[PDB]
Every structure is written in structure tokens, then in C-alpha cells.
Amino acid sequence: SLKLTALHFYKYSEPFKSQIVTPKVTLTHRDCLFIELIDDKGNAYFGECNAFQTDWYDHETIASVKHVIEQWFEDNRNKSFETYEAALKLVDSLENTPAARATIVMALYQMFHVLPSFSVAYGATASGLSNKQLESLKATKPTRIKLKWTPQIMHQIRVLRELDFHFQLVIDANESLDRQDFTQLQLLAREQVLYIEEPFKDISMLDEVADGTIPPIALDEKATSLLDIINLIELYNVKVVVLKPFRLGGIDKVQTAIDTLKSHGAKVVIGGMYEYGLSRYFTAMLARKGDYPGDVTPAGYYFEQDVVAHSGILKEGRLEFRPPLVDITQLQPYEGHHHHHH
């Protein structure tokens, strides 16, 4: 049997190697909330929250999650549970706050499973084709390349198809295309594109092009909740869904979501978002459940220093993962007398 006796909040905030610049936000650092739950035997387990400092991506933030988890602990502390299933029952009331729920579930999961060491396929992401990017692709030989849609897309695919290795091609249009892009979208269909992520901000635009004359469509930004994903699938021609575990409420909600989405005729790709090494491990762990290889980010892609080192090290086309062990000296108390600044 187990009982949760203590809860501590920490913060980690490393700078992005390359400043993040998107229409929705500018990020210099990845502020992140971490929780630590200690059981009645003094065993500590950590959870990584995927919420951001502000609501540019979602309504849940680091602050809102902290408050939710803090209250949750007050209501569940000292309660005994003997199984993972029983543990999950305590968070059933947090389904309205998926980011908070997912953070707690990440910790609970570790209390009942022996974490394996494993690898996942390496999928490269290119926002363009600089020499640095091209040389990286040639040296690493990814089995999948996700190219960002830009005015140079066709001129860049021409270069990629001359690489000496075969790969699946995915295009990410970032909800940026318009009616003037129809012709190129149809031409892209002849380039063996596995799927194109979010061609239009207004998904209804899909009804304006002949079905089957453009690449398979995937939801990413629009894959907000299982219910909403199903609603979009039933209304528009969607074939692929990029699922982020935290948006579903956590690790335990992934399989059921995948089964449901498959019953609706959609394929699933597990993905992450600016994660540190702890959450990255679990996103990678779930990757195998998908119909296509997961969208797992390599170690060191965003941050020079991580809270969990060697989490997703690229080796001969695959990302290697080890059971995640948080380096506590990297974490800082979230608030209180022990939260210091210099």
C-alpha cells in the first residue's frame, strides 16, 4: 500500500538555443513547473508539467496548474491506494484541467512501473534548408523529415530527394495557407507526402479542394481534446492526428484515445512540445502506440542544459532513452523563502 505525504513545487528555466519566434509567441526560455510527490516511505517521484508561463498556447498555465495540484494534494494527501488503477481514480476529478492532471499522472505512473531503456525513430524537422540543416540531415540520415512550408518548398524538396537515403516526407504548413496555395498543394501531392499538418487556419477551406488531390491532412494545433478531434474528423477530411498526451489529460488517456480515433478512421502520431528530459521520456515511451513513428524531439535540440541528461540521445538514426532521473540540483524551489534570485 502507498500514501502520499508531501508535495513540493520546483521551477526550471533554461534558454532556448535559438530564440523561439512564432505568430503566437516569442520565447527566450522554457519556464517549466515540476512537482515532487513523496510517499509514506520517503520515496520521491517527479512530474513535469507542459503548461507555459502565460496562456499563449492553452488556458492552463504554470500558475493555474500549481494552484490546482496544490488543492488536489490537500484533498488526497494521506489517502492509501495499492494499485496504479486506484491511484488514477484520485485524479478523475481533474479531467477539466488536463495539464495539471497529466503532471500528477506522470509521477503516479513511476510508483507502479519498472521503466525500460529503449529507442524510438529519429524524425528530423527543418524550417528551411540552410547548409547547417542540410549537413545535419546528411550526417544523421533520419527516416522522416518534416519540412516547414515556405515559398521555397518545392525548390527544397528537390534538394532533399537527392539525399542518399530514403525517408518519409511530412510537411507542416502551420495554419498559414490560403486559396492561392491550392495549386502548389495539389502539386505537392505528387511528391509522396505522408501527410501535411494544418494547411489552413480555417479547416472549412478543405472543402474547397478536390478530395484526394492533396496530401493526407493532419491535425496538430487543432488536436485540442479527444472530443474536439472527433468532431473535426467527422466533419472534414482528416486522416492523421498529432496527439500530445498532456492535452488528453496524461499517459493513461493515450491508448483509449488512439483506439477511439482509429475507430473513426484516423492514424495517430504521438508528439511533444518544448519538453525537458523527464516529460520527453514518457512522450517517447508512448510513441510506439502510434500508427506512425512519434514526433519525438532529440536531447539537446532546444536546451544546452537539461534536468534529465541523455534523454533521447541520437545514435545512428534513433533516439535512445534511459529511465529518467531528475538532477535535483538543477531544480529551484518554485516559491517561498527558498526561492532565490541573483
Q: State the residues that interact with Mg ion by CB under 5 A.
A: 172, 197, 220
Residues taking part in catalysis: 148, 244
By beta-carbon proximity to Mg ion, the closer residue of 81 and 122 is 122
By beta-carbon proximity to Mg ion, the closer residue of 107 and 219 is 219
Judging by beta carbons within 10 Å of its beta carbon (0-12, 13-18, 19+), is residue 151 exposed, middle or buried? exposed
Q: CB of residue 219 vs Mg ion: minimum separation in angstroms? A: 9
Q: Under a CB-based contact definition with an 8 Å cutoff, are residues 79 and 86 in contact? A: no
φ/ψ region of 300 (left if φ > 0, alpha if ψ in -120 to 50, else beta) reads left
From the annotation, which residues make up the binding site for Mg(2+)?
172, 197, 220
Q: CB of residue 174 vs Mg ion: minimum separation in angstroms? A: 6
By beta-carbon proximity to Mg ion, the closer residue of 48 and 197 is 197
By beta-carbon proximity to Mg ion, the closer residue of 51 and 242 is 242
Q: CB of residue 217 vs Mg ion: minimum separation in angstroms? A: 12
From the annotation, which residues make up the binding site?
172, 197, 220
CB-closest chain residue to Mg ion = 220
Q: CB of residue 172 vs Mg ion: minimum separation in angstroms? A: 4
